[PDB]
Structure formats: C-alpha cells, structure tokens
C-alpha cells in the first residue's frame, strides 16, 4: 500500500535517510484514529512534493519501529517532526490541513 512521494522508513534506514536535506515525517500507529483521519492529507502532501529537490515526506510506524519513536521523543500520535541534515528540528503542532502543512514546509525551506 505505497503512495507516490511518501517514504516509509524503518529502523534500518531512517537515520541514513534523514541525514541530508530536509524531511517532514509522520510518526503514527495503525490503531490511532487521528492518524487515520490525517492519512489522505499526508498522501496529498507527499504527492505534491514528490519532485522536490529540497524536502522529502516520510512516515514511521511506531508499532513496528518503536525505538525510532522513543528516540525522537514521540509519545503519542500522530507526531509530525521536521529533520534537517540528520537532526530533529521541530515538533509541528499547528493545523494539519494540507494548505497549512504546505505553508509550514515552505517556512522551513528558506535556507
């Protein structure tokens, strides 16, 4: 069940994946109702940014790769984190609609 533009990371590849550039990652659990509610929006976000040279859109299933989650202080879901050049930058707690997410992405790509 893959989606264009949307990376699905694992414990093996997560740190290597976020090492360069900017990343916006959805940490989720399949059981989480708010996560289900957000999933189509996140898929739209990924599709629209599929060809970006500056940001990649990802997700991590914290039921499968929990150490990634606890190691990034993820304690509930969905948690939307920004990474830049291998480091955790922000925990985005703003509005989660597509246009708000796009505006946040653009705000984090001013360098």
Swiss-Prot record:
Cysteine-cysteine disulfides: 32-35
Residues annotated as domain Thioredoxin: 5-110
Localization annotation: Endoplasmic reticulum lumen
Superkingdom assignment: Eukaryota
Protein's job: Protein disulfide isomerase of the endoplasmic reticulum lumen involved in the formation of disulfide bonds in proteins. Can reduce insulin disulfide bonds.
Family: Belongs to the protein disulfide isomerase family.
Protein name: Thioredoxin domain-containing protein 5
Organism in which the protein naturally occurs: Homo sapiens (Human)
The gene coding this protein: TXNDC5
Residues shown, of full length: 190 to 296 of 432
